[PDB]
Amino acid sequence: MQVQLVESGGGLAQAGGSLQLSCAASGSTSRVNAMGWYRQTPGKERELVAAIDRSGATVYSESVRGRFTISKNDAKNIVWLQMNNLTTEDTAVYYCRSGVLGSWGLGTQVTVSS
Amino acid sequence: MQVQLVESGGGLAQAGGSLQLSCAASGSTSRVNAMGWYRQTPGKERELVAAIDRSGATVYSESVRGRFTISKNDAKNIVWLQMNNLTTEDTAVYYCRSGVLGSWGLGTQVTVSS
Ligand SMILES: CCC(=O)N(c1ccccc1)C1CCN(CCc2ccccc2)CC1
Ligand SMILES: CCC(=O)N(c1ccccc1)C1CCN(CCc2ccccc2)CC1
C-alpha cells in the first residue's frame, strides 16, 4: 500500500570530500508529493536534514545549509542528497522518508507596513 | 477523509513587530504526523517557510531562520507560527499544510574520516 523506498549510496568519505545518497521509489508513487532526508548520529535524536515537495520547494537544517542539496527526478521517482564539504560531524545513519501532503487552504494574509 | 485545517491569525503588523499564526486540525488527525507553513508573496512562487513532524524535528527556510518558530500542541492538534522581527519582505499570504509521512527504512551509513 505504502510506497516502497530503496536507499543507496553512502559508505566512507574523507573529511572535505563529497558523497551522494539516492532513494528510489516504486509502487504507489502517484500520491507521494514530498520526500525528505533525516539523519541520526549515535546517541542523538534523529533530525530532519532536507526536504523537497512536488513543486520543487526545498528546506534544509541549519547544520547542512549550502553544503547539501536535495534534488529529484520526477519521472524516475528518485531523489538524491548531494553532500559536499563533509566533516566528521556528518557521520551518521541517513534515512529517506516519503510524504503525502494535503490540500491547499485559502491561507491568511499578513501585511507588514513601514 | 482528509484532515480539516482552520487557519487563524495574521492581519497587519508594523515592521519590527511580531505576529502569531495558528492552524487547528480536526477530523482525521491520527494519521497526520507533519505540519508545515508556506508563503507566497505576489508574483513569486510559493515557498516552504517552516515544517514540524511528530517527533518535534523542525526545519526553516533561510529567509526566516531565527525569526520564525514553528511549534505544536499535540493534544489540541494545533500548530503555531511565531513571527518575530518582521519586515516588509514578510508580507505574503501564509498557508498551513498537513502531511502524512511514511515508515522508516534501515537508512544508509555514512562515515567521514579524518
Ligand atoms: C516530491 C515527490 C514527488 O512529487 N514525486 C516523487 C516521489 C518520489 C521520488 C521522486 C519524486 C512524484 C511521484 C510521482 N511521479 C509520477 C511520475 C510520472 C508522471 C507521469 C507519467 C509517468 C510518471 C512524479 C514525482
Ligand atoms: C506533527 C503533527 C502531529 O504529529 N500531530 C498534529 C497534527 C496537527 C496539529 C498539531 C499536531 C498529531 C496529530 C494527532 N494528535 C493526537 C492527539 C491525541 C493523542 C492521544 C489522545 C488524544 C489525542 C497528536 C498530534
Numbering used by the authors:
A (entry chain A), B (entry chain A): 0 to 113
From the study:
JGFN4 expressed in E. coli was purified as a mixture of monomers and non-covalent homodimers, separable by size-exclusion chromatography. Both the monomeric and non-covalent dimeric forms of JGFN4 were subjected to crystallization screening and yielded crystals in the presence of fentanyl. The structures were determined by molecular replacement phasing and refined to 1.68 and 1.55-Å resolution for crystals obtained with the monomeric and dimeric species, respectively. Unexpectedly, both crystal structures showed a domain-swapped homodimer of JGFN4, with each protomer bound to one fentanyl molecule. Interestingly, the homodimer formed as a result of reciprocal swapping of the C-terminal β-strand of each protomer, mediated by an extended conformation and intermolecular interaction of CDR3. Fentanyl was surrounded by CDR1, CDR2, and a juxtaposed loop between CDR2 and CDR3, which formed a turn of a helix. In CDR2, R53 also donates a hydrogen bond to the carbonyl oxygen atom of fentanyl and to the S29 carbonyl group from CDR1 to help shape the pocket. Hydrogen bonding is also observed between N76 and the tertiary amine nitrogen atom of the piperidine moiety on fentanyl. The piperidine ring is also stabilized by extensive van der Waals contacts with protein residues from CDR1 and the short helix between CDR2 and CDR3 mentioned above. Of particular interest is N32 from CDR1, whose side chain undergoes a ∼4.5 Å shift upon the transition of CDR3 from the cis to trans conformations. In the trans conformation, L100 from the straightened CDR3 formed bidentate hydrogen bonds with the side chain of N32, which accompanies a ∼3 Å shift of the Cα position to shape the fentanyl-binding pocket. Using X-ray crystallography, we found that JGFN4 WT dimerized and bound fentanyl through an unusual domain-swapping mechanism.
